[PDB]
């Protein structure tokens, strides 16, 4: 289970996510990576999933994010769809919902997604030859 292709699903989705920016992607999320890091792999996944669920829940219909143009609206819908897809995969990996996140620091969603991508690529690297 630890080295399941779900890791590839998460990475591919993070790649799609980090290739769009926006007013939306500068809005913030609680920075689970600001911890001094006393945390199981499963607890990290639950944490990341929780904050991302907070984000897409809060901003799916946010007027700052919805967009004026057809293109901006499309990219918003794509962001929300990909955040849900990423979240679905993260919860599947976590096998958990009870993971309080206590961090004060907020980071932009963009910065949080890049950090998560780094962590996930490292996991992938640690799984393969």
Numbering used by the authors: 1 to 129
What did the original publication write about this model?
Signal transduction of IL-4 is mediated by a sequential binding process, initiated first by binding of IL-4 to its high-affinity single membrane spanning receptor chain IL-4Rα. This intermediate ligand receptor complex then recruits one of two possible low-affinity receptor subunits, the common gamma chain (γc) or the IL-13Rα1 chain, into the functional hetero-trimeric complex to initiate signalling. The overall structure of IL-4 comprises the known four-helical bundle in up-up-down-down topology, which like the crystal packing is unaffected by these mutations.
The structures of the IL-4 variants T13D (max. resolution 1.65 Å), F82D (max. resolution 1.7Å) and T13D-F82D (max. resolution 1.8Å) were refined on the basis of the structure of wild-type IL-4 (max. resolution 1.8Å); all crystals were obtained under identical conditions, allowing detailed comparison. For comparison, in the structure of wild-type IL-4, the hydroxyl group of Thr13 is hydrogen-bonded to the main chain carbonyl of Glu9; the side chain of Arg85 is moved outward towards the solvent and fixed to the hydroxyl group of Thr13 by a water-mediated H-bond. The χ1 torsion angle of Arg85 is in the trans conformation (174° IL-4, 176° IL-4 T13D) for both proteins; in the case of IL-4, χ2 of Arg85 is slightly off trans (160°), whereas for T13D, the torsion angle χ2 of Arg85 is in the trans conformation (176°). In contrast, the χ3 torsion angle differs by 115° between IL-4 (58°, gauche- conformation) and T13D (-57°, gauche+ conformation). In contrast, in our current study, the temperature factors for the side chain atoms of Arg85 are of similar magnitude in the high-resolution structures of wild-type IL-4 (mean 23Å2 for side chain from Cβ) and its variant T13D (mean 20Å2). These values are also close to those of the atoms located in the hydrophobic core (mean 15Å2), therefore the side chain of Arg85 can be considered rigid. Cluster III consists of the positively charged residues Arg81 and Arg85 of IL-4 and the negatively charged residues Asp66, Asp67 and Asp125 of IL-4Rα. Arg81 and Arg85 of IL-4 form several hydrogen bonds with residues of IL-4Rα; however, these interactions do not seem productive.
